[PDB]
Every structure is written in structure tokens, then in C-alpha cells.
Amino acid sequence: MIQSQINRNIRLDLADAILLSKAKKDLSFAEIADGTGLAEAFVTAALLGQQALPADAARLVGAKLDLDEDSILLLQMIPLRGCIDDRIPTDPTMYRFYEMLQVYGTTLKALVHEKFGDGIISAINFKLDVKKVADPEGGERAVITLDGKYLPTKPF
Amino acid sequence: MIQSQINRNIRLDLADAILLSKAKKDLSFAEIADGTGLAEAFVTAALLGQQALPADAARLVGAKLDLDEDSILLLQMIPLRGCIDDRIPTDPTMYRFYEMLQVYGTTLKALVHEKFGDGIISAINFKLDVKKVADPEGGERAVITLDGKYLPTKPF
Amino acid sequence: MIQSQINRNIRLDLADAILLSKAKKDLSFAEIADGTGLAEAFVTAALLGQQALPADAARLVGAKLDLDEDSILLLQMIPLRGCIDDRIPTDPTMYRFYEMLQVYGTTLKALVHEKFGDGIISAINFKLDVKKVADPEGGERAVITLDGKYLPTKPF
Amino acid sequence: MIQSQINRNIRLDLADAILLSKAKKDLSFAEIADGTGLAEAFVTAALLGQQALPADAARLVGAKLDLDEDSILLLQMIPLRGCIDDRIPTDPTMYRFYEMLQVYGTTLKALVHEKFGDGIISAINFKLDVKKVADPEGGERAVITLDGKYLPTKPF
Amino acid sequence: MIQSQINRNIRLDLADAILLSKAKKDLSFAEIADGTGLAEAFVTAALLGQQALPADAARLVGAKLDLDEDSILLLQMIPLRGCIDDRIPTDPTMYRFYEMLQVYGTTLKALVHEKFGDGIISAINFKLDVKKVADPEGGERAVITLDGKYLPTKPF
Amino acid sequence: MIQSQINRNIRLDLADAILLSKAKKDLSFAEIADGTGLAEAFVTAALLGQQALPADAARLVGAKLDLDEDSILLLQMIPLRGCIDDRIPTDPTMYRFYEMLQVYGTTLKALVHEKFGDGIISAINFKLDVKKVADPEGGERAVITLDGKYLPTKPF
Amino acid sequence: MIQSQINRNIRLDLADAILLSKAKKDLSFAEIADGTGLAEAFVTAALLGQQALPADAARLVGAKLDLDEDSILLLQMIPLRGCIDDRIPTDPTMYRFYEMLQVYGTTLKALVHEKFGDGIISAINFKLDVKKVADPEGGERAVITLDGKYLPTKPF
Amino acid sequence: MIQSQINRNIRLDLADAILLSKAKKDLSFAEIADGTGLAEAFVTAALLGQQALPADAARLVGAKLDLDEDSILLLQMIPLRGCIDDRIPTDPTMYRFYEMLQVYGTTLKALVHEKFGDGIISAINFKLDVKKVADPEGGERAVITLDGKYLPTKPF
Amino acid sequence: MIQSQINRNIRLDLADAILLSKAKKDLSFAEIADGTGLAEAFVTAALLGQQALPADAARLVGAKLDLDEDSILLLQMIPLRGCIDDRIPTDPTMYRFYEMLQVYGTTLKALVHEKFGDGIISAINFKLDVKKVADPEGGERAVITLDGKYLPTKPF
Amino acid sequence: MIQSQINRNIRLDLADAILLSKAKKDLSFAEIADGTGLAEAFVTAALLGQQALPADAARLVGAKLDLDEDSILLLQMIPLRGCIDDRIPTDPTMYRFYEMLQVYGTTLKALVHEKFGDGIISAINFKLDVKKVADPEGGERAVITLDGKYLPTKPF
């Protein structure tokens, strides 16, 4: 894929249409990603404008959601990424993930440098997943796994 | 503990002093936390101004770091949390965790509502840890586990 | 249930249409909510894009307001919450509630930690109500009750 | 009292000193306010730089906290109010009250206009209290009462 | 009136249309307010989306400006107030009033507290008028009178 | 006077010192300005860093407040004006004047152009005063007079 | 003229239409202003939404650009001024004039107070012109002249 | 020559010291620059932290102001330029030059491209001066000349 | 030539249309620029709203992309430049170039002043290109060359 | 190196001390880096707080600049990176590199995706250098080479 976007509004407008069609068909994101060979977090992110789908997956989810030909093509374009309206989320569900950064951001830095060294944990060579588990005290917990490659910073 | 702070600069200035003492003594965060009974991410976060240490743990790390009495008291105080200087990190290592939110924030929201329902994954009833694993294609990866309670949003 | 929004403009545009119909029909929020079994503050918030209505209540309020079938479906979706245009309200009526945070925010923090411990008063396990009472000295007062669960922050 | 401040840092620096004295003396805000004749939220807000104490209460809390003469006088000055560092709190405890505004701000406006009319609920002719109660489902809740005069907006 | 707005763009778009009709009809704000019994500043503010007109005044100004019935209803709605695009005016005429705040804002605070005590001068229980007077040095001056009730901040 | 400042912190730091001395001596702004031949609002603004005092008034207020020689010189310097910490006041007393601009800013623009024409009402050739009067409904009111030269905008 | 605007987008949308007509007709701003009796900077500013044209000039440039009657009327309206999208220009050509203020802003203040006294150089009683001259070392230079009335700040 | 600064606070603190010395010695910027062969705008900007002085000029002005040897050296370093505290000036005298950009910024762009072509008028190959002239209608005017080289933007 | 834009949205909307046509036709930027005689970075920048194409190149790329006549004209106008939506990129690919300025911006300043002197490296007399090369350790690298004229800052 | 910083001010204050010592000693960055075996851009960045020096290089440059032992240790710690005071540079020399992003940011994205695919050019696996070359039309140019590894974004 060599085609890319520069205005996030195009794919994000498509995301809204996808969500409406998805709600009318009573579909889940697991169901949509089923048969694509791709993880639910990757396929979901693509629908929401933050990843590009291969052609085969794009045609599959486009059929499932009744998308027109322009929209199936748009899902394959490399996006202009950035899902937050204005830098800091207002939505409580999204905000809690930002709050984890406000509380543990420097701890993440410190422990990455202690265990790996100078450099970063990648957000590109990177996998994400969300699992629901029982809480032994009652209720449920989300176990969200961030799996990123360590890239070192060395002198040159 | 019923005492709390309102100006983050006090605990963050202490953090800078802790970090210099820690460097002079060639100490790691894992070995500072050893013997506290507490996870390294929790103890590290406390040193960096973002959690309160129980008294026994505050005295132990204070001994290792040669902290004065006011500093050992300060580590026990409930902090004014917020480790980011100005809302968005400049540091590449912490920025990548912000970028995961810019790319996957809406996917996290969508999958949380899919698997749990309306509501939030807690940043309060919450544990995190960082593990280093080998990348089968070469190098190292960080597996960062966010483990939060689901709190539902229901009508009233 | 499992469907959710990512762009607040969809439900906020619906709220504008809802307010027009409500005004044209000379309806109050109390009487739109009457018969739903849900509190006026919850139903009002849903109309204004900040909560999801159960199917039975969305159908009922949609009949009262002559909403099309897509609008009744949108009311049931889990919203992308955040009602303030740009972080700080300009409207005097909403600004006063922000001002109470500028004046008493640190007092709320201090007294919450004093009475409960480290942690938060939840905005999720949470309800509020607005009550009109007579002022003994003349005129009327609003008694706005914020009722949230204490969630402790514990070492791990 | 006709003396007032223009730079919040003077009283906020004093607040930090008060908090350290309070912690060294193992005092609660309820204990400090006992005997002043004033509500704990009012006295606490004054200590934290957001209200002015009458002379007798200033002298009393200054004895309890072993404050010097300049500090006792500062507590009686009318403050430059505003406790939030930079408009939006970073601290989770304080942030939850902001989130209440992001979710319910327009509902509070709508319900205030429906029950009272055009105008505002006052943040000046206004009392606040925080009450710890049992959660009937288990645990504890905060019942926070905002009690403000209705001021109408009428043509002229 | 119990109906209120949450999106200022609706009444502001109406204001743009009102101003065009006013310009085509060569009308002044003084002429439009004549016969309403309401001050020109109040009626003007309502046209520009910042006040609500009573029904009789809305019908009279609507006849003068040839407004449709939806527009006449909208003028009676309680607005989402806030006339400044983005917090600080760009327009020189409006900016000068902001600059008066930058220069005299702390003086206004200091003199209010000196003459009245702790508290505010209300922007709600409030009247405003603009008068043209001759400058004895040549030219003209505006005398703009801000008339607000004092509301005291008292201990509780 | 040809000397001017470029960093407001110098004169604002002086202002804090002036306020402490003023408080210790139980002085009002009205009596500090007594005998200067200058209006209380002008003298007060100079003490608070927003105007320059002539040498005679600077010595006169400097004696009343027991200011050192450098301070009396500073009060004569042309200031770097701007009393608001960060663009929008947090203090309720100053905020209300900002809110009057949010509600009536466009009304003030419209009425200025109607009565005078294109141009501005000056904040430079400008005087203000604060008067305390009875509220005929009960209580007290402030009548704040803004008196500014009309400067026309003309084609060239 | 007593008619004014409050939303800059109306005249800025007109400016875009003017620019398209001007490009299609191969006209310069000098040619458009020729015959108006007005300086090219003033007429150009009016076309771009920042000044008001007298009626004779409005009709003339309207004929040159084949504008409709609503547009010719809009050009006569007193504008809501402010041509910069979001406070700081992104465009290099416009940014250089902002950079001149970042480098020389305090020097301009200092030199104005030294030559004139306390007060301002007016942006209202003000003329601007752009002159192209040869660079004696090769190339071309712009000599831009800012010609503003000095308005003194005097005690009262 | 080759030494440069990265923190504007160091030279801006030096500027404050220079202004205090200058005020005590009753010096003007014209007299300080006298004998340097450099324009008063250039020397003044250097004192205020926005240009570098040659060694001969730096010792010369340093002797007039009784600067220590570290200060004379600092004046010769290449500065981190930027005199505005926070992007938009609060001071009325400096604000007027920003307002000229809000009013004429796009006119300056349009006339530069008309007279010269695509590209910029330089703020680096650039000179400015401030001249006082008489206003034939009474009073005084400042003529500020901005003189910058045209650098073209050409295809490659 | 002499025509220029003031609202970036016009050319940026055209960019979106170009990208859609480009993807439908399976074209690369390299192929679109082929035959123009112009570098691929310059032509691409023009398509994306940030440069002006000469007439012959505009017609060539217009034919390739099946653009209408208004669009071919628009591509020849001098743009209102600025491709970043809100100052700091959200997109990871664009953000890495901002991060190189956060890490190396003061080093670039320091080394420019050491090797060249006071002044700037031009962004106007400026060429850039992107080259794909083998990584000697495995994989691919981008070698991005910024080639700008040095403009000195000298006294006047 | 497992030690890291969380507050950039510590290393940036050290950078200012380094720059003063460097200026007093008439040293260039090239000669400070000479004998380290490290590139001038890397050593310079470390001195300015944006990289970590290995122990041998830290001791060598510490000797050259007469740094104390705490400072030599600080240069070895992994920094909290971010050299720009407030997100967008004010300094002209630094700003030109930001302007290159405003003009070419979307072109860089487009050409990276065209030549490499989805993903990023690394700012971590990354080197840069600054070279002076003669301009054949007269004067000098800077050739700044940004050399980063391509990291692909692949489906998972």
C-alpha cells in the first residue's frame, strides 16, 4: 500500500458511518474481525481510522457492514493517525488510560531504562490486547497487555 | 494516613534528590523495593511522587537512600498526583505511551464496552508491571500489563 | 449494551434537534422522564449525549419527542462523553460549578483523604440530584447532592 | 477586612507550611476547625488559601499549628482565589469532580433553568459539606452537598 | 421560560441572519428595542445570542426584522452564553475592554474588597449602559456604566 | 519619565511587599492615595504594577508604606502591564468582569459602532472609578464607570 | 455606517470568493484600489475582511470584481477584525512579521517610551504602506512603514 | 562569534539588571548606543537579550552601565531570542504591534506576493527604526520602518 | 504569480480530492511528478497545499489526476502554508520529525552558530529530498537531506 | 547506565553552567567532542541535556569544562528529553526547523509511505549531522542530514 491520507476527518467520518451500520446490524467487533485472520484490536483500530486494512480484510468487513466501494478503498489507505479530539480525552473510559500515564508515566520511563537501557518501547513494533478476567473479590477486571519492541539509544 | 499534599513540586523536588542519591549509590529500583513487600512499580511510583508509602516501607527505602526525617515523612503523605510537566510528554520514552493512546484510545473504549459494558476500567483499583522478554526475531520486548477493575455505568 | 460512539458531535447534534422538538412541544425534562422509571438527571443527561438509555426508555422518550428510528437507536448507544465545548465553560450557569472546583477543589481532596483515605470519590459509581428549597432569608436555593462511592488506592 | 491579595503564591506557600506542621503534629482538619465556630470545609479552604479567616479563628488555628505572626495575619487577608495549578486538575481525586462537570454540566444547566429559571446557582452565597456514609451495598460513600442561592437573570 | 440551549452556534447563526436583515432594512439597535420596554443593551444582547427575550418583545423585534417563527421562538430560549470566539477577543473594539481587565483587574478586586468586603460584584444581578458624551478637549467619549449587586462571601 | 520595564515580575513582587506593609499598617487604598492629587484607582493600579507614579506621589506613598529608595524609584518606572496571571482570571471577584465581556462584549462592540462609528473606545485615554451605592431592593451595589475616548477608524 | 459584524467567518468567506474572482480576472490589488481614492493597503484589508469600504468604493470594487449586491453591502459593514486563524500565523510570509515582534517587541516598547513617553503608538489612528525598492547588494527589499499616532497615558 | 545561549532567562535576567542600572544613572538608550556605530534599535535589542554585541560595543555599553565582566561577556553571546513572555503580549504598548498583525497580516501577505512574488520578507536580513514626527492635526506620531530583504520561494 | 490564498482549507480540501483520485488511479507521487522537471518533494508539497505549481506543471498533473479547471488554477495560487492541523502532529510518522526537533533543536542552533555564525538556516531558500537506502545492519533507512542557505545576522 | 532523570530542569540548569564555562574558555563544541570518539551532534546534545554520555566521555568533557563530580555524574544519566521551552520555538534559528515541518510535514509522511510503506522513520535509531558547503550563487549553505531507520507498521 503506497496511498496515504493527510486529513483524519475523512476516515473518522467513515468510522461514524461504520458505527451506525454496525449498530443497526447488532454486530460486535469480534464478529466483524472474525475470518479476517487479524486480531480484533487491529481490525477495530482500522475501522476507527487508526490502521490500514489489507485488501482482502477490507473487502470482508466492507461486505459485512454494507460499505460502498469508495469506503472499502478508504479502509486500505494509510491513515493520518490520532484518535483524540483535542489532545486530552474528555470521555471517562478513554481518560482513565491517560490518568495511568499521569500517575505512572515516569515510573514506566524509570523501569524501562532500568530493565532495557536508554531508548524506548515501541508503539509501532507493537501489539495490544484486552482480556476480561474474574476478580477473586467479586466483579471483573480488564487485563490489557502492551507488547512493544525495545529500541535502544546508543552514542554515535 | 489522613495527611495529603496540594502542591506537587514538594514531592517532585524530593524525587530529584532521591534520584541523585540513588545514582551516587549505584542502586536500582528493584533493589530499593526489595524487602518492602511491595511491587517495584508501586514503590518506584512513590519515590517519584505518585503514591504514598506505608511507614515501614518509607523507613526502609529512606535507610537505603540516606534520606532525612522530613523526607521519610513526605514519602508517607498522600500526593498531589500528576507526573507530566505540561499535559503531553516531551520525552520520547514516555511519549510512546501517549502515542499508544492516540492510536488505540478509541479501540480500547470500544473493546471495553464490548466485553464489559458501559463504564470504565479503573486506574485506581489498578496494578501495573513491566516485564522484559526475548523477541524471537531478535532483540528484546517489553510486556506491560495494565490490570484494572471494571466499574459499570448503570441507570438511576 | 455493546455499541458505542467515538465522536461526540453525532449525539450532540441529536441533542440540538431534541431540544428544538422539546421547545416546540412545550415539554419539561421532568415530564419527558416521567414514566421511564429513571431519574430526571439520568434521562436528561442521556438526551444531552452523556448517558445511554435502555431500549424501553429510548422508545418512550422518542415517542414523546417524535424522533425517527435512527435517533431512537443513537440514544441507546454508549456515548463519547464530554459536554463542555472547550474544557472551561463560558456559560455563567455552568461556569459556577467550575468555580466551585477552583475554590474548593483542594478542600474536597483534603477532606476526602481525611475521612476515607487515599483514593477517589467515584464519578462512575455515582449519582446526583438537584433540589429546590426555600431560603429562610427570602428567595430560593438549589441543593445539589453529589453521591459517589469511595474507591481506595492501596499498595500492591 | 479590607486587605486583599493579588498573587496566589503567597497564600499557597503558606498552605504548604501549614500542611507540614499539621502532618508533624498528627492533626486532622476536623480537629483544627473544632472550636472556631466555623464549618470544616470553610476553615480547610482558608488554610489552603481560598477563604479568609476572621481574626479569632486565625489566632486559634495559628496556636494549634504553631504559626508565626505574619502567617496568622496572612490567613485573615482576602485571597486571590484559584486552587488549580493549570485549569484542569491532574490529581485523580480532584479530577473526578471535574469529570462530574464534563458529564453533567449541561444537565445541571438544563435542570437549573427548568426548576428555577434563567440565572445561576451561586458559588458565593454558597455552602459546601462532605459527609461520609455507609454504602448499603458495602463500603463507604461521600455525600457532597452544594448549597447555593438561585440568582435570576431578568430583563432590564 | 424553562427551555434552554446547549450549543451557542444555533443562536449565533441566528444572530448573523438578524444582522443581515438589520443591515438591509437600515435599522439601528435603538430602533429595534424601541417599544419593547427593555434597555437597548439587553435587547441587543438577546439578538446577539446572550439573553432571552420575553415573548412579547420577541414578536415585536421579529416583526421589525421579518424573522420566521422558528427564529422568534429561538430568541425566547435561555442561551448558552459566551460571545467570544476563543477566550480572548481579536477585534480591536472588543479587545479594549479585555485590556481594561489586564490593566485594572487587580485594582477592581482591591477596591471592591475595600469598599464592600470579601465577595463579588455580580455579573448576573447586573445592568449595563453605553452613553456618548462630548470631550471638552474636542471629540467624543463613551461612558460605560457597569452596575452590579454586591454579594458577600461570609464564613459558615 | 523615559525609563521602562520589560519583566512584570519585578513590579509585581514589589506589589506583594507593598500589600504586606499596607496590611501591617491597617491602611486602605483611599488613604494611601490621599494627598497625592490622583484618583484612588490610578494610585492603586500603580501600587499593583499597572501605572507609573509621578515622583512626588511616589515619595508620598513611599513614606506612608515605608518603602526603600529602589522601590520608590520602581514605582516611577513605566511598567510592563498585564495583571492577569494567565489570560483568564481564576479569582471569582476578577472573573465577574471577564464574564461581563463574555456576555456583553459583542453588545458593547455593536453599540459603540452605532453611537460613534467605526473605531474604538480607548483604554489609554481612559479613566475608571468604583462607587458604592444602596440597592433600592436591599443591599449594596457597585457602579463602575468606564470613561474612554472614542478614536475613529477612518479610510486612508 | 452604524452596521457591524460579530462573526468574522461571514466576511472571510466573502474574501475567499473575492480572491477567486480576482484570480480568474487576472487583477492585482493595486488595480482594484485604483480609482477608489483609497490606499491599496486599506482597500486590500477591506476585501480581506479587516476594514469597511465607503459606499462609493464598495460599488466600484464590486463592479471590478463582478460582485453581487449582498457582497457589496457586506464590504460596507464594520467587521469583526482578526485575520489570524489561531493567534500565531503558520504561514511563513505572515510569520516573519510575528517574528519581528518576538525579536524587537520590547525594543519597540522601550524606544516608544523614550521618544514619546508613557502610552501607546496607535493601531487605529494608523496608516500602513508596503514599498518595493532595490537591494543595493542585489535583489529587492520591502520597506514597510507603520505610521501611528502617539496616545499618552497620563495620571488622573 | 561562535558561543550561543539556549535559555532566554539568563540574558533576560541580565536585561533587568541593565534596566535598573540605566534608571539609576538616568541614561537613555540613545546615549548608551552613542559611540558604538550601531543603530539604537540594534543596541537596545542587544541589551534586552535579542541581539549579540561585538566585543568593542559590549565593553563600551558595559562601562556606561557598570557591568561586571561576566555580564559584558554574556552580551556578546548569540541569544536564544524571544522577548514575549507567552506568545501574545499583555502590555498595551507591545500589544498594538500584535494588533497590527491581526488587522493587516493577510494584507501584508497579499501585497508582498503581488509586488515581489512567492516567498517572504526577511526578519533576518532586516533593519528597523523608530522616528518621531509631528502630526499636522496636532500631537505626535511614530513612523516605524521595517526594512527586510525579499527572499523568493522557487520551484526545485 | 501574483495571486495568493488566505484560507488554507480551500487548498487542503483540494488535497483530499487529489489523494482520492490518486488512489483510484493507483498513482505514485513519483509518477505524478515525472515529466514536470520538478523534484518530487516540491510537486508533492504543491499537491498537498504547501507550494505553488508553475502553469505547465499544474496542467500536467491535472491531466494525470483528471482535475477540473478550477482545481488546476488553485494549484497555481500561492498558498496559505501550514500543513499541521493544530501545531503539534498527532500522526506517528509526522510526529517523529517533531521529536527530532525536541531532542536536537538546541544542538542544531548551537552547531549552526558554531559553523556559520549568528543567523539562520533558511526554510525558504531551501531544498529537501528523501532517499531510501539499505541499513548496513539489515532493513532500510531514510536519508532526509535539508539543504538551506545560511542567512547571517549582523549589526546595523 | 540504569539511572535516569524525570525533571529536565536539572540537566538544563547544568547546560547553562556548561555554556558559561565553555564561553569563558573560548571552546567550540567540535573541540569539546574531540577525543571522545563521539560525533559532534551527539556530544553537543548531551551537554544540552538531550543525551547521556558514557563515563569516559563524561570525564573527558568534564575535565575540559572544569565540571564538578556531581555534574560529571549528571551527564551520564539518561535524560528527561525535550529541549523546547514551550512546544513551539521562539528563537528564529530553531523556528526554521519547525517551519520545515509546517511546510513539508505531510510531504515527508507521503514520501515515506510511498518509498517504505506504513510505519515511521525512527527518531531513536537515528543519526544527524550538519555540514557547511559553498553555495555556487554565493555564500554558504547548511546540508543537514537526518538518517533514521524505517520501522514498519504491520497487521497483527
Swiss-Prot record, chains A, B, C, D, E, F, G, H, I, J:
<feature type="active site">
    <location>
        <position position="122"/>
    </location>
</feature>
<dbReference type="GO" id="GO:0003677">
    <property type="term" value="F:DNA binding"/>
</dbReference>
<feature type="active site">
    <location>
        <position position="99"/>
    </location>
</feature>
<dbReference type="Pfam" id="PF02560">
    <property type="entry name" value="Cyanate_lyase"/>
</dbReference>
<dbReference type="GO" id="GO:0009440">
    <property type="term" value="P:cyanate catabolic process"/>
</dbReference>
<comment type="similarity">
    <text>Belongs to the cyanase family.</text>
</comment>
<protein>
    <recommendedName>
        <fullName>Cyanate hydratase</fullName>
        <ecNumber>4.2.1.104</ecNumber>
    </recommendedName>
</protein>
<dbReference type="InterPro" id="IPR003712">
    <property type="entry name" value="Cyanate_lyase_C"/>
</dbReference>
<comment type="subunit">
    <text>Homodecamer composed of five homodimers.</text>
</comment>
<dbReference type="InterPro" id="IPR048564">
    <property type="entry name" value="CYNS_N"/>
</dbReference>
<comment type="function">
    <text>Catalyzes the reaction of cyanate with bicarbonate to produce ammonia and carbon dioxide.</text>
</comment>
<feature type="active site">
    <location>
        <position position="96"/>
    </location>
</feature>
<dbReference type="InterPro" id="IPR008076">
    <property type="entry name" value="Cyanase"/>
</dbReference>
<dbReference type="Pfam" id="PF21291">
    <property type="entry name" value="CYNS_N"/>
</dbReference>
<dbReference type="InterPro" id="IPR010982">
    <property type="entry name" value="Lambda_DNA-bd_dom_sf"/>
</dbReference>
<keyword id="KW-0456">Lyase</keyword>
<dbReference type="InterPro" id="IPR036581">
    <property type="entry name" value="Cyanate_lyase_C_sf"/>
</dbReference>
<dbReference type="GO" id="GO:0008824">
    <property type="term" value="F:cyanate hydratase activity"/>
</dbReference>
